[PDB]
């Protein structure tokens, strides 16, 4: 009922569903939206330029009920870029609301 294996199965299912969304969801309202993507943690939709994008805490997480209302955030700039530090090669992401470190370190080991 709570195991690394169960969580892995849930992650796989999360990925499968996200992949369906990426392929099947209709194009954004305009030309300029930030592009949808799966970052191995969460499914990001197309983002409106100039807007924060809010995504529910990924449901496969073992503690996914500690945080039922929670969201993880990206920002889509006016130029249609995901907000990203000059110092980094990954987009800015705030997942503070979806935190539970051993499980979390493993969660981000690629």
């Amino acid at each position, epitope marked *: 009922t709570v195991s690394l*294996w169960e969580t892995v199965q849930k992650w796989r299912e999360y990925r499968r569903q996200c992949q369906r969304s990426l392929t099947e969801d209709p194009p954004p309202a305009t030309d300029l939206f930030c592009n949808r993507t799966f970052d191995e*943690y969460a499914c990001w939709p197309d983002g409106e330029p100039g807007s924060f994008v809010n995504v529910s805490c990924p449901w496969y997480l073992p503690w996914a009920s500690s945080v039922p209302q929670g969201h993880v955030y990206r920002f889509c700039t006016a130029e249609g870029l995901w907000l990203q530090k000059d110092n980094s090669s990954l987009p800015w992401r705030d997942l503070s609301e979806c935190e539970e470190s051993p499980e979390e370190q493993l969660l981000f080991l690629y």
Partner: antibody
Amino acid sequence: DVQLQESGPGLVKPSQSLSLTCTVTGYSITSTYDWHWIRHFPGNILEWMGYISYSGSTNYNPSLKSRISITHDTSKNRFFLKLNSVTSEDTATYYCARATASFYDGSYYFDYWGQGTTLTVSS
Amino acid sequence: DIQMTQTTSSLSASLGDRVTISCRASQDISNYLNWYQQKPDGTVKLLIYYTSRLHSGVPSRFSGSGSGTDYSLTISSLEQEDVATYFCQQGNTLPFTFGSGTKLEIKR
């Protein structure tokens, strides 16, 4: 440096109970990973038996129907295999293993193994 | 209830030669295929997971490939310490199941 090592009786009489211990060092068994039992028959059949998770949740191979229990003692960082009413078909080398996973591709695999302990069932 | 078959149960190759060990699953296992090495003294080591990923510490002479139901482990140049039995394992669905193994020995 994670180490696992099996201990237990090398010899058991038919219909008796089998009890094996896996002693884990270098990592807490109540954190993150799942902890598995696997046995190797003479003739190279390798059979998955079951696991106990870091949370104490278990899951067993259906073939080992009612005969098997996996338990742990978290204060001593050990987990256990009990196999009811063994027969000579339970003669095998018994391994404990840690399972980890990658959340980059969803793979799940046994990254660390005990040395195995041989068990013979005979009267 | 997935059957793993390693059609070759025994193989002999010369020192320095390329070695291929093959595995076939009874159904599509979506690249969740792991390779293990069991030495003659019984010690078991993970070599490869998720078809082709090398576990850290494992020699780069080992590689893996495949998809669907068919997978292979390759040793680019056989060395003495590779004498061992090699097992595949699907990690797609419970119960986990292993191939019957391929025992690798030296051809002289």
